[PDB]
């Protein structure tokens, strides 16, 4: 029964058109539209994008097509028929490829209720292109944007708009591997200008906060550390050299090592980082220990002891107030500010 | 001669709706349905999924398409007639996407007993999102929900509801890479609640056991070793430097290249985890040689040779203490608790 | 000509069902069945599974649909006229995925032969799982099983049965790129057993061995040839430390850095493995060096000079002869047995 | 409406054809068409190929099927209606493989202007194939081409021409991970000579810069400084070998690891590149020091001091000079030049 | 009007059968294809195949559907008329897949000519599976090829031949990442036997020479230069042992992490390939320092002192004989002959 009656609105009995758009030659048609996102993962440093599938709720009401006459509340139509009926045209602007799930039955849900409002959900998985700036890496922040705009109808054909209430809805627990989502969702309009006219866009912005912790233990504190080890190699005897200058020499291959195999785990690119910064800062003074004591070894070859002696309480000084300005400097720098 | 008493059943002969579900305007539909899964595999850190292709069988009774009159029992129809008879309208909630199997001849299967039973099963490839916590790696336990809901049926529509005996069942032998599968396998309900009301799904929880075993001979061992090694460079005489000062040296760089490996080989994870904990301990100690026996060798240069020797008993006692206690800490903490 | 006269036997002329087996309510129809693969590749530890292609040949013959009147032998119907005619249903039991190749023209080949004898052949590229002990890693014997059964028909209505002559024909010069398939190839019957019946499948067995020889020259002697250099550092002086313990930490360092490197290239498994075994006891022998010479550096600072040389001379014969018993039991349990 | 008097047009009524192009059997075709690009990616030494999804944009009138009877302007007809009018066959010469967005709605979007002319814009994402020479891999420039040709029609039957203003239209914020795009991008004509005639192309080159700051940081000076180190090591004793010879070892293997991790990290590549040239290089000044340190150790062993002098002052001046003249040879032939 | 003449010869109007092959019970049919190739790419050890899109152009003529009475010369018809028309029915014998490419228009072209002549061309993406022995890796000289075999029709039925002028065609300038494309394209016939009959495939080979210079410069150069620091350590004191025994640990050192950073960098393979051998060889050099120097440093501890000189000299001598006379074999053997 309610498939016939289905037949008599969205079927050539009567009259209805899948071409043409509700209120053709007049008012612009508004779909109240929100999602409710399933999932994020893989996002990429190197595709420069991430994957996310999502519920996609639509919501219009087409003057036409409207029964008030049948006795059932609602309606529901089989995703084969979907076709009859108008729907809004809408891809997401940003997107490198999207799909449908056919699993099962057809995801596609539709819903013509009585007044003649329609309710059009369906769920997408779809791989979105965030731009991502990894200037600092360790401390970074970053902003994912979604957007959805109709495409082929101007400003004058049809408008997209948020939900009022719970507009874009996180599904909870999503514990991304690499990130955190951060709590708060700030959507807002957006509009583009064209030759053509305007169109319609609604830009969803999710904050994904990079956590550094695993790099805070993991790459910095093992290099400071060596760098501590070198400081202790300048309080090493004015005499000696191959336990001191080995001390040096020793902290130089540790530093490169551990320089390189960070070089190998992080996500490869080819501008400088902040991370990267750093490794190179460290190893710079790792270096300047054996410079400094290189030049008291080849002074020490009465004045010239007492230059080296200088040389000695100036480094102790030196080198750790450097490090600890640099430090100051950097973190300050880099994490928030 | 079952076709065509299939095709009066099924066929606009008679009547008969694929849009409409059994008792339409009356009591809700339970489908009975159990799963026997072929695989599990590509357990990713990375996309925080896993993949899993299984056999959904499906069991409802619509009191219509029923005959009794035919001589045959049950009945089967070809999977292009399958549109013809209405299907109960299922997803996975958690999946990023899945595949029907066509190859050879199409692996959906239905059967239409005499009584009005229905048989419906399908096999299904699917890739199913897990929330994974390896906040604990090494001594990891993670668990992995399959929930199956329907699609656009409120309670009052449909129910699913799993198989008394044997409702889901791990086909022997799968032997996970990196896992083992634990075998007892926890299913329960689950109720969604929306807006638009309450929707049905079950959930199935297998528990999946990370084995340390890998993890406890390639990382740990050689580590713990280099600590002892470390240790015995504190028996190291009170007078010689470059072969002290060279175990310990000699120490740091092989506990930096051995952190290095581990942290190319583990899965890439910016939150801090067990393992890393434990390795920068261990860096932490090696660290320790050095700065107490620098500490030693500084003083050394009457009552700071009894201080040294008293510094050096007191690092004998300290460090296998220090470490056993933290040992004591760790094993329990991460390892059940 | 051949089209319409196919067109009279296929067609709704006459009689045909292409739902309907041959022999309904009847004896059992025999399908036999052999393949001819292609090729093997992508076999990874860690989606548990291989990639092939094959050449499915089955045939059957079917009472209904023999002309014997017609000039012509045999016949051949268009692929997609496949459907007109039943074909046995068949799927792998074991894959993840699998495909048609559509390629320039389509790929299926029936022909329908004059006493009514059918030969349906079909090309599939399809990933098989297997299950793999990598227990014993460099030493590997895998199994790899084929397994075809039919789907939705219970040993009432069919069977599956291999060829006579070459029922699994291996395309030559296949050169798998890490193993060496074992020319035998031991084909079997395998029967399921469930709630609805039995039904039938044929396995097919491919021995894989790998070949060791890369670990063997990259991995084992480098490693074993350090363990002499640590023999050769028990030679050292009974007087000086730092080129002696120098000996043994670089011993051990290079060791370390061996063991992380090979932990890199292997394949990533969690529970241990023979390689894994292997390395890490050459690293026990390798501290064991440090172990009994720290004893011997110890006991130095006459009697403990003589416990230090009988030290000395027990080290020289145990750790060959300790490492000769070692390597007996460990390459015979390996390497066959 | 609109859509009927679209079918009288583009339907069987009166009479069109899908299968012959405008002016059939006269003047040739003009296909004015330009494209925005959405994003680029995935830009792999590997596959030696780019990732990019475009929206096309195509403009060509037929004088046949232009109304200017009917009060509406322009017109938009259903993407399944897109068949019934002839479109320009056009692929692009160069991609893998690319495909069309079906995400929600279509992607293809068309317009029939009231004087006839055709608007045809769709959505491709697509992978084309640029051929890279690494042959200087830090200082590199690549150069894409994106090239458009018609499929099966001569100059005689249609020519694919840029648009005047804003042909090629970069969407602003792409922020390739791995190299900056040249604000300039340089389009200009192709033309395909055949046995079977000549045919059109449009031929598209976007200027990528590789940006060599990661490779600076993290490559070249650390393996520069420590070559200064072994500068550093020249100066050494004119007596002592270990912490001399010592600082020479440490030296090189140092440099050693360095060139191991950055192989590790670069793109793979079997001809020589510019950042192995200069590794290479570096291990070789790297080795002289202990070549010219070495002839001056066995030297050594009144004339003979003489000559170690006038070696060791020589090396001093030699070193630095040598590597600066390298240096200024270097930089200048890689970079621009 | 091309179109309903076209629909004249090709439709159901007189009479035609795309089942039935041009010349039915008569003599073979010849299609004379040639392929014009856009690209290579993805040659992997891993998978055992690369990836190649080309211009697939058959020709062959039918003595019906030749008109000859039409004004036009030759005629197209639409990608969606293609099947009306027989098409000789042609896989690769070797690929693992494949597919065509549907972006924009349909790449599939065909025309028809006057005297009944047919030009059939269409762009195939697609894979093949090349077997590739690395048994010399760096020195490496590997053969592709592509065979093109009729499927389902035997000798008597159809056969294919190239085209006598450019049968196969390279695109210019494909610059394969990690190969050299030798410019001699050798192509022949192949015949396939089989119990069903004789089947005709065209094979063609391209030979592809791996370019050694990235090995030449990144693993074999640093490798021998550490052989000759040993050999300078062979120079050193013949009392001290911490510099020397130093030299040669180092030297030990750096070849193994050499050695293992290279087995990072190479492609996966379980059976020994030459680099491996050579890398292993200059291990056991580098080994045999410090053994032929530890009988040294042990036979010191008058007569003992002679053999330690003639040791040394002995070793002097051997060395650089012994390794280049394993150059002179190495070499000769894996290069060319
Ligand atoms: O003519 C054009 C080209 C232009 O391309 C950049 C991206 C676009 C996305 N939407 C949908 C198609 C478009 C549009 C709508 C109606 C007529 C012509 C037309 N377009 C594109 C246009 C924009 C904006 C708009
Ligand atoms: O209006 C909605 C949106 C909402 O989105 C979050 C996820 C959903 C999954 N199932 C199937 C579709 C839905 C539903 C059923 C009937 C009418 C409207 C409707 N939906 C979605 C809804 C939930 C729950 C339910
Ligand atoms: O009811 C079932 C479920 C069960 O699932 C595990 C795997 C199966 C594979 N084949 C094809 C489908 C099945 C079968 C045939 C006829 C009626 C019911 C039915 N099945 C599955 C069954 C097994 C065995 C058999
Ligand atoms: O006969 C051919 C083969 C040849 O192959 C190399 C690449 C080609 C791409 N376009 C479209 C097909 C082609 C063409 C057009 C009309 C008749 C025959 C024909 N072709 C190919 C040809 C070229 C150029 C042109
Ligand atoms: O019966 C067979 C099986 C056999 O399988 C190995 C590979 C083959 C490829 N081509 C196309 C199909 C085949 C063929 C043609 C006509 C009748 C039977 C038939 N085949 C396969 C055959 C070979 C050769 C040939």
Request: without cysteine; charged residues 20%; glycine residues 4%.
């Given at each position: 029964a309610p498939s016939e009656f289905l037949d008599k609105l969205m079927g050539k009995v009567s009259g209805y058109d899948a071409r043409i758009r509700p209120n053709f030659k007049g008012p612009p048609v508004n779909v109240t539209c929100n999602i409710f996102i399933n999932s994020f993962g893989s996002i990429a440093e190197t595709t420069m994008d991430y994957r996310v599938n999502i519920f996609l709720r639509q919501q219009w009401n087409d003057p036409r097509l409207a029964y008030s006459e049948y006795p059932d509340?609602?309606?529901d139509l089989d995703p084969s028929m979907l076709d009859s009926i108008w729907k809004p045209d809408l891809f997401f602007a940003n997107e490198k490829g999207a799909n449908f799930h056919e699993v099962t039955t057809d995801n596609k849900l539709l819903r013509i209720s009585?007044?003649?409002?329609v309710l059009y959900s369906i769920?997408?998985?779809?791989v979105l292109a965030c731009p991502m700036d990894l200037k600092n890496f360790p401390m970074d922040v970053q902003t994912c944007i979604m957007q959805l705009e109709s495409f082929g109808y101007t400003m004058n054909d049809l408008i997209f708009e948020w939900d009022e209430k719970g507009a874009v809805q996180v599904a909870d627990g999503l514990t991304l591997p690499q990130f955190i989502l951060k709590e708060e969702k700030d959507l807002r309009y957006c509009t583009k200008h064209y030759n053509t006219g305007k169109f319609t866009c609604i830009e969803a912005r999710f904050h994904l906060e990079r956590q550094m912790g695993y790099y805070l233990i993991q790459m910095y504190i093992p290099s400071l550390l060596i760098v501590i080890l070198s400081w202790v190699s300048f309080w090493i005897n004015m005499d000696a050299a191959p336990a001191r200058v080995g001390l040096g020499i020793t902290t130089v291959l540790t530093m490169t090592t551990q320089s390189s195999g960070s070089r190998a785990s992080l996500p490869k690119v080819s501008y400088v980082k902040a991370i990267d910064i750093w490794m190179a800062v460290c190893l710079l003074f790792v270096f300047s220990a054996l410079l400094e004591y290189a030049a008291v070894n080849f002074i020490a070859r009465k004045l010239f002891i007492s230059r080296a002696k200088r040389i000695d309480t100036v480094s102790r000084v030196a080198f750790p107030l450097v490090f600890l300005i640099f430090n100051i400097?950097?973190?300050?720098?880099?994490?928030?500010?």
């Open positions: 509340d609602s309606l009585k007044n003649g409002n769920r997408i998985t779809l400097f950097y973190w300050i720098t880099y994490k928030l500010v």
